[PDB]
Design a protein around this ligand. Structure first.
Ligand SMILES: *[C@@H]1O[C@H](CO)[C@@H](O[C@@H]2O[C@H](CO)[C@@H](O[C@H]3O[C@H](CO[C@H]4O[C@H](CO[C@H]5O[C@H](CO)[C@@H](O)[C@H](O)[C@@H]5O)[C@@H](O)[C@H](O[C@H]5O[C@H](CO)[C@@H](O)[C@H](O)[C@@H]5O)[C@@H]4O)[C@@H](O[C@H]4O[C@H](CO)[C@@H](O)[C@H](O)[C@@H]4O)[C@H](O)[C@@H]3O)[C@H](O)[C@H]2NC(C)=O)[C@H](O)[C@H]1NC(C)=O
Ligand SMILES: *[C@@H]1O[C@H](CO)[C@@H](O)[C@H](O)[C@H]1NC(C)=O
Ligand SMILES: *[C@@H]1O[C@H](CO)[C@@H](O)[C@H](O)[C@H]1NC(C)=O
Ligand SMILES: *[C@@H]1O[C@H](CO)[C@@H](O)[C@H](O)[C@H]1NC(C)=O
Ligand SMILES: *[C@@H]1O[C@H](CO)[C@@H](O)[C@H](O)[C@H]1NC(C)=O
Ligand SMILES: *[C@@H]1O[C@H](CO)[C@@H](O)[C@H](O)[C@H]1NC(C)=O
Ligand SMILES: *[C@@H]1O[C@H](CO)[C@@H](O)[C@H](O)[C@H]1NC(C)=O
Lengths: 436, 266, 231, 438, 232, 266
């Protein structure tokens, strides 16, 4: 009876690889689920990694968990990873980080790579384990080697990072990546001037002959493929010198983020686009789930996008009383990776008491760490407001006025609000002087 | 006009909705305003509330300082504003100073004073042929003349200090217009004095015509000196002005209408 | 959801007895486990609280004053480079800030200001980087007068935080009001006293038991362990 | 007063160093080097070596060998690491100084001990290809790793500006997907540009003259992609050689370790003197286009050992004497033969065939044409092998193996059809006439 | 002059007596050597002769057939793959030349040619790859007839040159005439014999005496010796 | 023929200069012949030389097999040549066969042969009105009728199995002109046989000559209908030839010279 199980799965594998249509994908997924009726493991994991995620099947978290139990009973390597993610992010089941850690480590022992990614990042930014060099480095190496081998052959598919609210650490070496960047930008300047047919004068553009600019932009996309590919080989090789002994000395803290900038690009980060696409046609239950895997995995784009989705309380899995703490968690994770807007959003979350109690001191220090390091005029003006009303710390004026002043020169678009603020500040000052 | 009060109510309602539209999307004070700064349907609306607001401000001040328009200076203001509004629009693109909504409010002061300066010229020629003028008319004009003198004096003091510390920029040409704006307020001051001494005595004065002709020759000479200096300072630095030639011809005509008239008379 | 509580999995064999001190290990919380190579396992997790302060903090050492006394005598101080000003911190004498005005060719103007001179059962704890961490405060004043306090000499408090990789450098610079500042110094010696040590959470240990017929620890990360030892 | 002379020397040298770094003009370079000469008058060492590497190489000064050696002896007595290297090069190539390999070896070893890098590369190759010393893995591995580390620590920062290996006798496991996407993008750009509105013969007349606006930044994009890709490629080669040398992953291997450290070092930054010697070959100054190639040949380039053997071949270099010009070209042909160049083995066979330099020896040239044939499948080696087979040059005469060699010469290349045609016609004509005479 | 003569640098120190055996050392061919760290050295050079063959060639071992009879009696012989053919030489039994034709599905045709069957004070020397090396041949004929020489059986010679790390392989195959062949053998055994050994040129040693006030080993070379031994 | 030897000797000294120029750069045999092959100028003189050699070869052929020209067919030799030599280059500039020294000859031999088939038929129309022809004339032109007939046919057999054992290529067109050269000898086949009975009989034959022209008109139509079935194959594969329409055009002209002529006689 096992013979008919794999044969039906072969039809779905042929239809999925041979056709990218929505109805063809749905039929192939139905055939895969029919093969998964009699516990066919390969199709069971293939229907699992779409049924819980969405955008291929209707979402059923409880059925996914109840069959993840048998999938981890057998010892499937991608059965441990996703159920550990389920226990970690609190998805339809009581959260516990230790169980999530053991399931993640056994998935990493199954030869999976998303588990290795998640273990390298959770070792790197101290989440659920001590911050450590060695095991974060070897977990990121075991993924970056595979990602390098894949991009050396297949060409390294380019994926656009879109944000939804849109040592040697200066550049991690120089040279080859820089030259790739100027090659990219000069090809970018080459294609844009070529479309220009404003000097046509009955010719040149050939009367809506689109057949030039189409393969212009496809040549541009293919050049982008080649340039990001060579960029990633460059980063991987500089990282492989920086890791072991050569060229530069032994340097952990400027190797694991160069490895991580290779592992992030990879092939796993195609779920960014199919999460962004799921966001653009309603279906808020499907983007907050595909972003949570890429958030626990270690992306800074997805940790922000998942926090932004959780911020506006459209995520239907989580309770409405527990939406903000998870949003606070993902904002805090995005803050440690150097994202600016995450720090101010953490400041506002402490400011209005979003999820936590209202406490102005942590809000002030969050606004400051956004201020002196990333030079964000928004945190400058917000901590000046924090000064001028005397919350948290003592009340005075001239600290606010200089903060509004460097809020003014820090960004060009900050001209208006610093003016209306120092206007009301001077009005208050003159009224107090008159009262004096 | 009730329709003037109608479009001004519709103006504040338009800016009233965009900010509320901006406040709904972005909930905090700082990011709700920068959206108004950058995004094109929001920012194009907000200044033409400010344009009609400074029109209403200029009107409500004009009723306080002038009892009633004579329906003869309304047309004189209409063309004189229409040339100058093009001269100010051309100066903003030639200098390549870009769109910054903090300098747009600066030349809107310049055209508001220049419009009210022309109102003093069209009120002092009527006062020459005014046989029944009350003390309120003299007081409301000598208050306007004194107030315009200090504000012109305060703005060049900001300008010639800015030209020494910062350097050659758009502030230099604005203080030169303000220096020219001092020239047309000096003419009425002599004309008011020569006509105040005319009304207090019940006899015509033959020396008043000579004093008015000699002073127009004096202010005619200082008007063409300020024009020929602005040409020389603008060819050495920056680029070709290609502006302020329209009132240069009027200043050249005023020099011709004063020097050659005095040559024929004397 | 309590990010900063660690965990560590270990493989102590077949026979093992759950510890009583520290954390409590229960029996219902066990999980049946297997890898890809058919090895059955049972992992038990403790309750993740790590609460209270029952670490038996006994310190016969003296007050925190004498540990910094060698820094007074040596007079070897570091500096700090900021955006415009340059905050020079010396311990036991005074704090100084200045900004060099390099004139073209012959002379250097100096703008030298003066922060100040130096001629309880619940320990105070401050917030740096969002985490709660104890500190020892000191107080001094009598600096240069500031006109915005109407000729009042300034005062400032100098901060002590331990770091094993620190060399008496300045982490950040802050002020709470006009002409009153706060300077944060990272000194490596004072944390050896337990109460001033950095508050690191104790590691909560999860042990995975090996059911017999399987190795004591899964056959996969054996070669993975051999893989890192050759790189 | 001697200290004041030293004070003025560095004052003189700094102006020349600033002028050289700030201007690329030939007159500016000559003036800066005249400042360097006046600095060298008071025996300023940094100026001594900076003018010593131009008085001998003939690139910024009128070339004069004897003064260069006369100050090289002072630079070595003082103990410079850039004076013992080039004095070793002089004693190796017999350049204005009587030749001896042992003095060259001791000078090169002390120039390596001084921390120079050209001497490190030279000793690495001469231990690699077994010239002057014993062939070994270890010494070549050390003296190539010590250069590969430096050139990666230079290229990981500065990017390692490109140079193209141009050949005088010709003109005159990572990276598949990037390469295939790059040529695919190129061919899509080119078909899009040739689609246009006839980008060549347009409506024309007096031409629109609107401007092409596409070529220079396109060449800039290609050039920076070339520089970026060669950077990444030798990054990958360094890592591959390290992992083959230390033992991680793949065990210690000797051979592909040194062959990658060698490619890493060769693609380095002293390959701008390839261009300096080629550009000194145009404008007709061979006396300085063979000395900047002799050094790059001692370092171990196969482009330089062939260009400097082609330059020594046609009797153009006027420094080396007329009675020692062919052995000094035979040596570099032999060195460029063992590095896998087709033309070098053929020309070595030609040298042993015509008795150039060495005595005439047909049987020895036979082996050289054979090795050019079977190793690399070069058509002219098959054809010349057939010619030696045809009239018994060095071996017994035979017709049928000569015919076999001519047909696989015909199959070997699409270029060789005509001369093998008129050879097989002449072979059949001689055979038919001889059979008629019999 | 050439690229055959090898040199090796030596650092014995201060005291050194010039050896009177082998190469000759004369006292004018000296160079005075200063490093970067102001250490003074005295380097002596050898005279480049490397002449004669007075290596005391006395061998009491057996005949070369003794080192080859076991290679004949082992009956395990080597192969070689060519572009079209496949030359199988078997030492002591025959040499086989053939090519397999793989017909589509059922037939496998073999084009077999037979190269033969076995039913002096100066050693002759063959120039392989431009180096002179002394060999031991095996005369052999009676192969299959060749139509080029009116059905004359093929003849061949089997060529023996040692190589210390060998597996009885074939370096190259040559055809001097038509249907007369030449094959070579790289074996690790027969240059226990006195004369068929690779003629390594003697290593002319270069010594660098250390003058007083200087160490016997230069400082930069001293730490270069520990780095690669650790890196080994 | 002094001018003819002048053209040959000057050209030989021109090819004698090029092979001496190439020898001076590359002193050896094989690189000399290679360098003459690749370089565009050295190839064109050899192109020019080979056209001269075939020009002398054609005249020597025209001397031996044709005793004397009647001074009315050389223009008929001229126009059909530049039909054929334009035919071959148009097919070559269509098929992208590129300039190679192995097929440029084959078009020229195609141009060579096609002229003599024209020179065959003009000699046999003059034979139709020749009252004094010896046996040496008759017995020697039939040899030319037969010998170049088979040499074309065997080269067609060499070509049509080359195209069959490789695939669709440029050799497809080659046999197709060879096919109409194959009919070209079968054109003079029937014309000699019908001439053979006219000379031996001292009386005109009415229906015999009418049936002779009827048979030749028949196969001449069938020969072109195979040739139109040749060309029409090449729309589906490769590309529109834009050539061989000129002897498409005459081909149906020969059919209309056959169908209407038979209808009038019937
Ligand atoms: C990539 O690899 C491909 C392999 O898959 C290469 O493929 C080529 O494939 C063609 C197939 O058409 C091969 O062509 C010919 O191959 C056979 C065998 O011919 C070879 O062997 C001949 C043997 O003759 C000698 O044998 C003894 C050797 O010891 C001598 O002692 C003896 O005296 C005799 O001289 C050999 O002579 C021949 O070389 C040339 O020699 C003759 C005579 O001088 C010349 O006239 C020829 O020009 C010939 O090229 C070949 O090396 C052959 O089939 C034979 O057997 C069938 C059996 O029915 C007979 O019917 C047939 O008549 C003939 O006797 C065919 O003639 C065939 O055409 C070619 O050899 C392959 N090439 C290689 C290198 O293997 C492909 O070329 C490769 N691509 C590259 C390298 O770019
Ligand atoms: C395996 O498939 C059968 C189908 O009949 C099902 O009954 C069974 O429950 C499946 N196994 C598990 C562990 O669920
Ligand atoms: C999760 O655990 C808590 C407490 O252990 C329990 O109250 C809750 O019901 C559990 N939920 C599930 C789905 O097991
Ligand atoms: C969320 O959980 C707690 C439990 O009492 C509380 O804050 C609240 O009742 C819950 N939320 C809602 C919407 O009931
Ligand atoms: C070194 O400088 C002195 C000072 O003039 C000079 O006499 C001497 O010749 C110089 N050395 C050499 C080798 O020229
Ligand atoms: C160099 O060698 C030649 C060759 O005999 C000799 O004449 C000359 O004296 C040598 N020069 C030196 C400095 O040894
Ligand atoms: C090279 O050798 C020849 C042979 O005698 C001799 O003339 C001289 O040594 C050299 N030739 C020249 C031209 O000097």
């Amino acid at each position: 009876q096992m013979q008919e199980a794999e044969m039906m799965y072969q039809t779905g594998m042929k239809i999925l690889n041979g056709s990218n249509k929505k109805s063809q994908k749905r039929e192939a997924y139905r055939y895969l689920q029919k093969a998964a009726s009699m516990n066919h493991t390969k199709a069971l994991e293939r229907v699992s990694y779409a049924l819980l995620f969405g955008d291929y099947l209707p979402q059923n978290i409880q059925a996914a968990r109840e069959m993840f139990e048998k999938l981890t009973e057998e010892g499937s390597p991608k059965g441990q990873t996703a159920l550990g993610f389920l226990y970690a992010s609190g998805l339809g089941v009581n959260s516990s980080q230790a169980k999530a850690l053991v399931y993640y480590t056994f998935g990493a022992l199954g030869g999976n790579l998303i588990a290795h990614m998640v273990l390298g990042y959770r070792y790197w930014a101290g989440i659920g384990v001590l911050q450590s060099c060695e095991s974060a480095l070897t977990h990121y190496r075991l993924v970056a080697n595979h990602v390098a081998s894949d991009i050396s052959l297949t060409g390294g598919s380019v994926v656009q990072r879109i944000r939804l609210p849109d040592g040697m650490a200066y550049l991690y070496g120089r040279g080859v990546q820089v030259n790739y960047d100027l090659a990219l930008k000069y090809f970018q300047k080459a294609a844009e001037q070529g479309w220009v047919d404003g000097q046509l004068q009955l010719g040149s553009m050939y009367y809506n002959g689109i057949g030039v600019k189409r393969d212009y932009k496809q040549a541009l996309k293919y050049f982008n493929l080649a340039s990001q590919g060579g960029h990633i080989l460059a980063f991987y090789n500089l990282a492989q010198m920086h890791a072991s002994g050569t060229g530069v000395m032994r340097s952990c803290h400027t190797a694991v983020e160069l490895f991580k900038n290779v592992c992030e690009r990879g092939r796993w980060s195609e779920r960014l686009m199919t999460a962004y696409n799921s966001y653009k046609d309603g279906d808020y239950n499907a983007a907050v789930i595909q972003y949570l895997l890429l958030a626990e995995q270690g992306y800074e784009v997805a940790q922000s996008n998942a926090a932004f989705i959780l911020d506006q309380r459209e995520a239907s899995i989580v309770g409405e009383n527990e939406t903000y703490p998870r949003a606070l968690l993902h904002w805090n994770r995005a803050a440690s990776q150097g994202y600016t807007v995450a720090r101010i959003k953490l400041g506002d979350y402490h400011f209005y008491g979003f999820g936590t109690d209202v406490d102005y001191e942590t809000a002030f220090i969050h606004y400051r760490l956004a201020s002196e390091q990333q030079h964000s005029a928004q945190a400058m003006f917000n901590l000046g407001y924090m000064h001028e009303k005397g919350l948290g710390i003592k009340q005075d004026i001239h600290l606010a006025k200089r903060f509004y002043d460097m809020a003014a020169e820090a960004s060009p678009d900050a001209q208006v609000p610093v003016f209306l603020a120092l206007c009301k500040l001077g009005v208050v000052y003159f009224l107090q002087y008159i009262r004096e | 006009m009730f329709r003037t009060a109608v479009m001004m109510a519709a103006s504040l309602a338009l800016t009233g909705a965009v900010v509320a539209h901006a406040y709904y999307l972005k909930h905090q004070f700082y990011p709700t305003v920068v959206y108004l700064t950058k995004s094109s349907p929001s920012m194009a609306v907000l200044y033409i509330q400010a344009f009609v607001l400074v029109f209403l401000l200029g009107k409500v001040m004009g009723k306080v300082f002038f009892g009633q328009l004579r329906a003869a200076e309304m047309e004189h203001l209409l063309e004189r504003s229409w040339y100058a509004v093009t001269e100010t629009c051309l100066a903003f693109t030639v200098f390549r100073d870009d769109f910054s909504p903090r300098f747009v409010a600066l030349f809107t002061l310049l055209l508001f004073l220049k419009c009210f300066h022309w109102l003093a010229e069209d009120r002092v020629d009527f006062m020459e042929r005014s046989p029944n003028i009350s003390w309120l008319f003299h007081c409301r004009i000598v208050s306007l003349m004194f107030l315009l003198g200090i504000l012109d004096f305060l703005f060049v003091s900001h300008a010639y200090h800015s030209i020494l510390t910062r350097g050659a920029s758009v502030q230099l040409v604005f203080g030169f217009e303000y220096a020219i704006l001092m020239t047309m307020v000096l003419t009425i001051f002599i004309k008011y004095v020569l006509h105040s001494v005319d009304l207090q005595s019940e006899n015509p004065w033959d020396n008043k015509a000579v004093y008015m002709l000699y002073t127009e020759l004096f202010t005619g000479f200082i008007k063409v000196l300020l024009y020929m200096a602005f040409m020389t300072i603008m060819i050495k630095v920056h680029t070709f002005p290609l502006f302020a030639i329209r009132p240069m011809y009027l200043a050249m005509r005023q020099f011709k209408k004063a020097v050659t008239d005095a040559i024929m008379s004397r | 959801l309590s990010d900063d509580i660690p965990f560590r999995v270990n493989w102590p064999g077949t026979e093992f007895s759950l510890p009583t001190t520290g954390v409590l290990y229960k029996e219902d919380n066990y999980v049946i486990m297997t890898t890809a190579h058919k090895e059955k396992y049972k992992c038990i997790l403790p309750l993740v609280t790590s609460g209270d302060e029952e670490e038996e903090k006994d310190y016969k050492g003296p007050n925190p004053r004498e540990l910094l006394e060698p820094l007074f005598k040596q007079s070897s101080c570091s500096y700090r480079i900021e955006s415009y000003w340059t905050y020079e911190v010396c311990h036991g004498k005074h704090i100084r800030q200045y900004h060099e005005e390099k004139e073209t060719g012959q002379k250097i103007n100096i703008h030298e200001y003066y922060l100040g001179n130096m001629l309880s059962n619940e320990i105070p704890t401050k917030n740096i980087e969002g985490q709660m961490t104890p500190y020892y405060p000191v107080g001094m004043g009598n600096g240069t007068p500031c006109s915005l306090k109407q000729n009042r000499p300034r005062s400032s408090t100098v901060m002590y935080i331990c770091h094993p990789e620190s060399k008496h450098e300045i982490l950040s610079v802050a002020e709470v009001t006009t002409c009153e500042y706060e300077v944060v110094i990272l000194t490596p010696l004072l944390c050896s006293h337990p109460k001033y040590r950095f508050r690191a959470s104790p590691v909560n240990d999860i042990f995975c038991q090996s059911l017999p017929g399987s190795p004591f620890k899964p056959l996969t990360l054996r070669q993975l362990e051999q893989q890192e030892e050759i790189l």
